[PDB]
């Protein structure tokens, strides 16, 4: 099996680089964040613009959905995160504490917590209701590029330009593992596999790696794309064939067979770096987004 992703929609509207796209867990919406300080919401199936959510004072680097699809959190150069009620557009809470740009963010599966990573080299864990910082982890010695909860919220994985992936106990704030292979290029992205067994890590040497968390060993290596400069999102696609999906600095979306490591498709159309990709929770749909000289989001659909 190889997928057959075909371009369905191009979503135009952001006036600067798009930074992150994410599908809502209920599958109904796509959220995009941008350097233009805005979050936009679009229909996942029809690509139709829904609304703009605004409030940050500088550009946004990341956005994430709560499990019930009703809240968003965004991470901004204004050094804050904001929690938003999507239906009302209200900023419920502004999460203050970071001392430099906030780069990445995610809700835990229960969605009572938010994890953030910053250029201040810390990872913070926040309470969603109170907006209070619960924990500040001395996570890394360079900007934190990604943070992600595993499927039961018990672990956080973080990555940094310092070349390390670290795994944290959500409950204690304790570092449970540091992952490093045979070199330490900047790690520009990390995330847990849906089943929580693996971590997918991007490094700025044009390489993606699949790590077995428990064994602390690299199992798979994916290459062929270009990634030396930007923190590009990568994904596990699981709705059809089991793929790895990533953007690339040659303006393509790359799709690999997870087990064989072969490139199975390259999606063409963007005119600048594909900084973000996201996979729909139930259907074979990929969203991709590009930087300043493109400014668009694309939705692609496949039979498998």
């Amino acid at each position: 099996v190889k997928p057959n992703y075909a371009l369905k929609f191009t979503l135009a509207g952001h006036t600067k680089a798009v930074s992150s796209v994410k599908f809502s867990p209920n599958g109904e919406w796509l959220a995009s964040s941008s350097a233009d300080k805005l979050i936009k919401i679009w229909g996942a199936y029809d690509g139709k613009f829904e609304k703009t959510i605004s409030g940050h004072k500088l550009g946004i680097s990341d956005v994430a959905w709560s499990s019930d699809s009703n809240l968003l959190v965004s991470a901004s150069d204004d050094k804050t995160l904001k929690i938003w009620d999507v239906s009302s557009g209200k900023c419920l809470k502004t999460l203050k504490g970071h001392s430099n740009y906030v780069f990445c963010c995610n809700f835990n599966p229960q969605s009572n917590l938010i994890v953030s990573g910053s250029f201040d080299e810390s990872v913070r864990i926040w309470d969603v209701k109170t907006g209070k910082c619960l924990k500040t982890l001395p996570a890394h010695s360079d900007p934190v590029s990604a943070v992600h909860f595993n499927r039961d919220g018990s672990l956080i994985v973080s990555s940094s330009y310092d070349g390390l992936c670290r795994i944290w106990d959500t409950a204690s704030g304790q570092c449970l593992k540091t992952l490093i292979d045979d070199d330490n290029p900047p790690v520009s992205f990390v995330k847990f596999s849906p089943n929580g067994k693996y971590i997918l890590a991007a490094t700025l040497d044009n390489t993606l790696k699949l790590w077995d968390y428990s064994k602390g060993k690299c199992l798979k290596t994916y290459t062929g794309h270009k990634n030396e400069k930007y923190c590009i999102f990568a994904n596990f696609s699981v709705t059809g064939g089991k793929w790895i999906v990533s953007g690339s600095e040659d303006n393509l979306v790359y799709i690999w067979n997870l087990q064989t490591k072969e490139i199975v498709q390259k999606l063409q159309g963007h005119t600048d770096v594909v900084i973000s990709t996201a996979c729909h929770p139930t259907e074979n749909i990929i969203a991709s987004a590009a930087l300043e000289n493109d400014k668009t989001i694309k939705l692609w659909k496949s039979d498998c």
């Binding site: 680089a17 350097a35 233009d36 550009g59 680097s61 150069d77 923190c231 930087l291």
Partner: peptide
């Protein structure tokens, strides 16, 4: 006049 380098977001810039 607009600023020469409109502030965007860290993800859209290259960090050395």
């Amino acid at each position: 006049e607009p600023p020469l380098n409109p502030h965007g977001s860290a993800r859209a810039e290259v960090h050395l």
